[PDB]
Each structure stands twice: as structure tokens, then as C-alpha cells.
């Protein structure tokens, strides 16, 4: 049933049964400083960044080198660009990053406080101004996060300077999977603006279906990293289980020497401004703003066996668990073979035996459903056409449809049975005949 051959995995073989000594469980920062852009466009960072052996990566002081303008991105920038546009509020309390305390702050606890407000960017970036205000006079926070650049107009020259970048690190680029899907997910192919002030966090969790993530501090403030190789991520789970948080939709804040305890390896960094950090597939992070500053992140799925696989993973573990896979892979892996051609070896294999399934797949439901009598139309395709998900279930629905009505909806085959037992009342669609689908996967082949 499964879309994944185990006998092909890339992942690294970490059987580390050993407690590793104290210098491992604080392993130092992978990290990169760009002299000029010529290193920055060189495919030796590429391999880098994507190794499945580095977790996460810090490039130093690569605006500069790319010469990228990041008072663009500044506070009194973006007032003006949008000054009503929408950004939602997390309020907190502000404590010290390897720490989170209960309310009388009695004893150290995973589950992270937040709370939601919405608000203008206008009012954040006076409050941002308001709250630096006080700390000079001196000498409960609030935090902006999910802010859409999205719109190419007003945003039009913000978006056009994250253009200077490597093509492997920029929002579009034909060698990204985000960049196939072929719709908009936002936050992944569009641009996310977080503003923040000291103490500003966000808790523990991996990227959607595994992809990887490019931030960029815009400064002035620091910004204080944490991250777990995506090995570990299972036992992580196992804590927030037992301490009675979602996993994946909560709010948790790691309790290091839980980590530790656990013979579980940490990497904290800083991120100062200009520094570009890129988490690669499967990393478990957090963050906290040592400053004010403002962070621009979107998401990349590079190519390459790993990341393909990572993101294979959790969207069968989603499917699992019912929760939604924000990436329509099945829908990605075909809109891919056919525009991209692949080098990979190991890479292509892969999408290879996916699609095999996910044509395997397709003739028995297919098979089951013309000796049940049912009728099978087939709708063609639009250019610039959505994946399928279920109303349900919300797991994603390719080739065979079921439509209903009262303006129309896509269920997958079990949730469409349960509402009506015979599929009456349901049309059964294929977006791809079989042939189609039969020739377009042996037209898929090596790229030297
Ligand atoms: O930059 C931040 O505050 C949070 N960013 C992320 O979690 C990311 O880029 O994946
Ligand atoms: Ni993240
Ligand atoms: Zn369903």
C-alpha cells in the first residue's frame, strides 16, 4: 500500500546506542560565511545546506554579500507598503529561552502558553516602537507572526530582492517541489513576515510535510535558535504526549535537560542580522527573539532523494493520523516527472516507485469500482488546477473523484461510502485515463 520503497531510504544511520559525552549533546552550529555572491551561487553551499547530516545551517553575514537590502523589509518599510494590512498577535510572557515555567513558576513544563489576537500592522509596528520606548526609560509581550507578503503588488520590491538569491533558496524556482504543486500554500511558496519584540517565541515543530525552511533575520534584534536533527522527532513526540500537548497541533517548549536526559543533541545558534538560516527536511526547532527585530521564512523543498523522501514520510504519517498534509504530494510527485527532468539517481528511483503505486493504485480502485457496476466518467483537466482533498477526512484525492452536490464537493472513496452506502448520489470521475497516466510514467526518465 505504501507509496515508499524502505529498501531505498538515504537517511544517515545514526544506531547510536551510546550515551555521547557532554560535548556531543552541545554540538557546535554547522556554518557558513559568504565572502562574495560567487561562493553564495557555488553548488559546494548547495551540498552543504541539503546534507542529511547537518540538521540545520547558519550562512554568515550573507545579505551583505549578496549586497541584499533588508530596510525593505524594516518596520517603517512595511507601514508604508501596507500600514492596514492584517497580522495576528501572540501574546506571551516574556522568560529566558531554555526556560518555561508554570504560573508560579514553581517547576519547568512543555506546554507553551499562547494566545491569539489580530491586529494591523500599523498599531504591531507603534506597539514594537512603544515597547523599545519603555526598555530605554528603564535603562507580557506581544508578538507578530503571519504576515502574508503574498501579494506580488504592494510587496512587488520586497519579493524582487529575495530574487538576488541562489536558486535553490528562493521562493519559485523550477527546482523547487513547493514551486509544483501548482497552487498557492502560504507561508511555503509565499513569503511570511514575523515582527517581533524580546522574548518573542515559537514553539517546537517541524515544517509542513517535512520541507525545508529559509529564514532571514532583518535585524536589528538577535534571534536565538534551538534544533533536533529529525531522527529524534519521534521521542520529542513521546514527551509532548506525555505531558498531554498535540504534537503536531500544539504549543510546546522543550525542556532541555529532558532533551539531554534523553541522549538527545542540541544545536543553539544566534542569528544576528543579515544571517540567513536554513533548516533543513525534518528538523525539529524553536526560536526566540533575543531582540527587536523583524524575520522573513518561506518554505523549499529542494530536490533530492532526502527531502523527497522526508516529505513521503510525513505525509503517510498524516494520512495516519488525520491530520492534513499542507502539500499535495501524490499531485506533485506527476506535476513534477513530467515538467522536470532529474539527475538524481537515488531521487529518481524514488519518484519513480511512487508513481508506480499511485498507478498501481488508480486500476484497482478503479477495477473494484467497474465490478461494483458504478459508472466512471472522465473530466479532463484546466490549466492552473487545485489538488484534491477530501471534505472529511481532508486526505488528498488524485485521479478518481467523487462529486457531490447542495456547490459541489470531493470526498475520498470511504468518507463518499459512508454518506451514501452504494455511491448513489455520488459521480465517480477520473482526472486521467489509464493510458495517460501509462504512457506519462514510462516518458519519465534519467537527466544526465
Ligand atoms: O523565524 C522565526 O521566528 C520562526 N521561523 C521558523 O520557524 C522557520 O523559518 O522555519
Ligand atoms: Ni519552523
Ligand atoms: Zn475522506
Redesign the pocket.
Known amino acids: 500500500e505504501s507509496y515508499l520503497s524502505p529498501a531505498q531510504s538515504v537517511k544517515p544511520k545514526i544506531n547510536t546506542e551510546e550515551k555521547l559525552p557532554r560535548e556531543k549533546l552541545n554540538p557546535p552550529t554547522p556554518s557558513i560565511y559568504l565572502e562574495s555572491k560567487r561562493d553564495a551561487f557555488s553548488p559546494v553551499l548547495l551540498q552543504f545546506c541539503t546534507d542529511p547530516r547537518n540538521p540545520i545551517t547558519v550562512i554568515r553575514g550573507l545579505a551583505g554579500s549578496l549586497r541584499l537590502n533588508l530596510g525593505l523589509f524594516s518596520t517603517k518599510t512595511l507601514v508604508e507598503a501596507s500600514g492596514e494590512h492584517t497580522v495576528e498577535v501572540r501574546t506571551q510572557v516574556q522568560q529566558p529561552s531554555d526556560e518555561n515555567w508554570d504560573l508560579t513558576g514553581t517547576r519547568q513544563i512543555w506546554p507553551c502558553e499562547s494566545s491569539r489576537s489580530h491586529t494591523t500592522i500599523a498599531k504591531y509596528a507603534q506597539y514594537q516602537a512603544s515597547s523599545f520606548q519603555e526598555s530605554l526609560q528603564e535603562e507580557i509581550i506581544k508578538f507578530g507572526?503571519n504576515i502574508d507578503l503574498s501579494d506580488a503588488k504592494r510587496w512587488k520590491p520586497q519579493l524582487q530582492e529575495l530574487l538576488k538569491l541562489p536558486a535553490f533558496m528562493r521562493v519559485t524556482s523550477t527546482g523547487n517541489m513547493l514551486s509544483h504543486v501548482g497552487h498557492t500554500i502560504l507561508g511555503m511558496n509565499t513569503v511570511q513576515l514575523?515582527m517581533?519584540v524580546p522574548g518573542?517565541r515559537?514553539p517546537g515543530?517541524q515544517?509542513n510535510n517535512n520541507f525545508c525552511?529559509?529564514?532571514i533575520?532583518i535585524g536589528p534584534g538577535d534571534?536565538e535558535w534551538f534544533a533536533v536533527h529529525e531522527h529524534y522527532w519521534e521521542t520529542i513526540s513521546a514527551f509532548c504526549d506525555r505531558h498531554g500537548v498535540d504534537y503536531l497541533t500544539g504549543s510546546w517548549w522543550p525542556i532541555l535537560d529532558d532533551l539531554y536526559a534523553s541522549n538527545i543533541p542540541v544545536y543553539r545558534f544566534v542569528q544576528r542580522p543579515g544571517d540567513l538560516?536554513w533548516?533543513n527536511a525534518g528538523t525539529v526547532?524553536?526560536?526566540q527573539?533575543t531582540g527587536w527585530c523583524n524575520?522573513i521564512?518561506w518554505?523549499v523543498g529542494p530536490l533530492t532523494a532526502y527531502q523527497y523522501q522526508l516529505a513521503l514520510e510525513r505525509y503517510e504519517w498524516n494520512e495516519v493520523k488525520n491530520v492534513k498534509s499542507i502539500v499535495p504530494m501524490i499531485h506533485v510527485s506527476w506535476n513534477v516527472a513530467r515538467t522536470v527532468k532529474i539527475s538524481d539517481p537515488d531521487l529518481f528511483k524514488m519518484i519513480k516507485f511512487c508513481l508506480l503505486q499511485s498507478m498501481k493504485h488508480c486500476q484497482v480502485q478503479r477495477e473494484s469500482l467497474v465490478r461494483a457496476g458504478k459508472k466512471i466518467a472522465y473530466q479532463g483537466r484546466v490549466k492552473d488546477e487545485p489538488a484534491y482533498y477530501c471534505n472529511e477526512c481532508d486526505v488528498e484525492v488524485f485521479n478518481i473523484l467523487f462529486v457531490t452536490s447542495e456547490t459541489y464537493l470531493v470526498h475520498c472513496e470511504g468518507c463518499a461510502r459512508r454518506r451514501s452506502a452504494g455511491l448513489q448520489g455520488v459521480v465517480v470521475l477520473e482526472q486521467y485515463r489509464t493510458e495517460e497516466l501509462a504512457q506519462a510514467y514510462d516518458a519519465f526518465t534519467l537527466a544526465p
Open positions: 507572526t514575523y517581533k518573542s515559537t515543530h515544517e525552511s529559509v529564514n533575520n534571534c538560516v533548516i526547532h524553536w526560536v527573539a524575520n521564512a518554505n
